[PDB]
């Protein structure tokens, strides 16, 4: 696409500059261009791709919720039209991310750290599509569940319970259960088991790894506090 003529290394450098400048749409476009070079992504590059799109979709989700709330209260065509405009843009970003994962990040990801990372992203972006779905909603939910489940299976076999990627996956899958799948009990069980198994493995970690794992464990605790 529009990044076809730029060097892969220059696209990564510019994605890091865009992050510093809080220019997340540019950051996402640079990372999309880097993925389209066809080479696999390093751990840092995967995180740049995920941070970029998370920030872009985050702004769209926050705007969609404000508009949906105004629309719900109002129930002319303007509020619905504008909510639809934002919704279509959000769907477009999710479709772009899912397209990058399917062409061909997941199929080339053999290591647990990369494969779980991508399958979790696949689960997350189908979850963002499910948040706005009313039509296909069931099928979108199934696609999110399937991706999260494959990621969970690999993570339980290949990573320790304190693995930051494994923890973040479990955190997100528990939120999918709570408010997308209408399975609050599954959500609470998953968050509790994940927290308890990580706590039991903290003794194996260095000071820095302990900081990384406990930060995510606190998010599981925050959710459990709100849910129980």
């Amino acid at each position: 696409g529009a990044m076809g003529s730029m060097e892969r290394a220059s696209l990564i450098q510019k994605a890091k500059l865009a992050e510093q400048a809080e220019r997340y749409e540019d950051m996402a476009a640079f990372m999309k261009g880097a993925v389209e070079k066809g080479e696999e992504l390093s751990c840092e590059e995967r995180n740049l791709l995920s941070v970029a799109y998370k920030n872009v979709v985050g702004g769209q989700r926050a705007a969609w919720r404000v508009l949906s709330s105004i629309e719900q209260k109002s129930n002319g065509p303007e509020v619905r039209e504008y909510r639809e405009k934002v919704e279509t843009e959000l769907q477009g970003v999710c479709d772009t991310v899912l397209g990058l994962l399917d062409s061909h990040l997941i199929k080339e990801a053999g290591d647990a750290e990369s494969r779980v990372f991508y399958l979790k992203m696949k689960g997350d972006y189908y979850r963002y599509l499910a948040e706005v779905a009313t039509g296909d909603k069931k099928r979108i939910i199934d696609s999110a569940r399937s991706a999260y489940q494959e990621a969970m299976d690999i993570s339980k076999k290949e990573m320790p319970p304190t693995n930051p990627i494994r923890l973040g996956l479990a955190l997100n899958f528990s939120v999918f259960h709570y408010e997308i799948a209408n399975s609050p009990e599954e959500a609470i069980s998953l968050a509790k088991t994940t927290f308890d198994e990580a706590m039991a493995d903290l003794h194996t970690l260095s000071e820095d790894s302990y900081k990384d794992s406990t930060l995510i464990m606190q998010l599981l605790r925050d959710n459990l506090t709100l849910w129980t």
Binding site: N55, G58, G59, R61, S69, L171, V175, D222, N223
Partner: peptide, 12 residues
Amino acid sequence: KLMFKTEGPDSD
């Protein structure tokens, strides 16, 4: 809407 904690940037 009450948003629960998810991984990464709290961008919404």
